[PDB]
Design a protein around this ligand. Structure first.
Ligand code: 45K
Length: 282
């Protein structure tokens, strides 16, 4: 770590603090993560170094020195949370929302094809550059290591499913899509039950008809209040029918019915996708 000069703190993640740093040898500007503290973890994190894609933040190096772990990542100058805040008065243009959603689905389709899940997608780990690219940061770390935001958590995780699938990432990205469009978080829960009941109040309390097996889930309670579903026209105005159709498939309750990233890329909403240039203030 004597090979790195810390510039400034750029994040306070779940696995540890993230710093902007300069590699004293190559002159490279990187994102340095010091993991807060196992052999199983080293092996799984070593596999992530090979999971390379243009929409995935590159894991450059794994440094296991003095019983401490450091992850060296590719550096990007802004995240989607800051960009959404900077664009709050005018909203992100629909062509740029569509481009970012299409690129994130490409990154998801790639990781999911390698049986790698993110599990904790949120605007703070979606990173953007001046070329119009958007990249996913921290794919696979949750599985590798084993106040936290609940806003993007899939309902099967909240209902105590221990063996959840790639569908959890589609749910999180659907919540992010809705937030880019409306300029407000879709389900801003501040406890696990508030998160669950916010989902229920919008999409309706799930039952055996819409989600076979839901009533046998570990944290399912028959005492859950029964709310009726709301129209998507009310949930994400002024999003057109193609966008609302795609979002509804990303937010299906049953993980098995929820659209895959690969099928989502073929949805008619992406018929006119382009790659615009965002205006970034750095
Ligand atoms: O470049 C990076 N790579 C990684 C890899 C993993 C990882 N985990 C959590 S963050 C992160 C980052 C990362 C953060 N970058 C960055 C740079 C500048 C600004 C922000 C973020 C927030 S802002 O938009 O308010 C100003």
């Amino acid at each position: 770590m004597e090979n790195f000069q810390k510039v400034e703190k750029i994040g306070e993640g779940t696995y540890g603090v993230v710093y902007k740093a300069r590699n004293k040898l190559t002159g490279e500007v990187v994102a340095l993560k010091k993991i807060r503290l196992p052999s199983t973890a080293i092996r799984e994190i070593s596999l992530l170094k090979e999971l390379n894609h243009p929409n995935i933040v590159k894991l450059l190096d794994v440094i296991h020195t003095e019983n401490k772990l450091y992850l060296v990542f590719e550096f990007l100058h802004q995240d989607l949370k800051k960009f959404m805040d900077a664009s709050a008065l005018t909203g992100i243009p629909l062509p740029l929302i569509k481009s970012y959603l299409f690129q994130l689905l490409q990154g998801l389709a790639f990781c999911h094809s390698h049986r790698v899940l993110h599990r904790d997608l949120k605007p703070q780990n979606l990173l953007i550059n001046t070329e119009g690219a958007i990249k996913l940061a921290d794919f696979g770390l949750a599985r590798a290591f084993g106040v936290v935001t609940l806003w993007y958590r899939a309902p099967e995780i909240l209902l105590g499913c221990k063996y959840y699938s790639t569908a959890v990432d589609i749910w999180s990205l659907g919540c992010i899509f809705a937030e880019m469009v409306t300029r407000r978080a879709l389900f801003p829960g501040d406890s696990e039950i508030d998160q669950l009941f916010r989902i229920f109040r919008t999409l309706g309390t799930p039952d055996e008809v819409v989600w076979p097996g839901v009533t046998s889930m570990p944290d399912y309670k028959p005492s859950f209040p029964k709310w009726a579903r709301q129209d998507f026209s009310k949930v994400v105005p002024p999003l057109d029918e193609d966008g609302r159709s795609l979002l509804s498939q990303m937010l299906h309750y049953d993980p098995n019915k929820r659209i895959s990233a690969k099928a989502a890329l073929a949805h008619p909403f992406f018929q006119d996708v382009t790659k615009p240039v965002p205006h970034l203030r750095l």
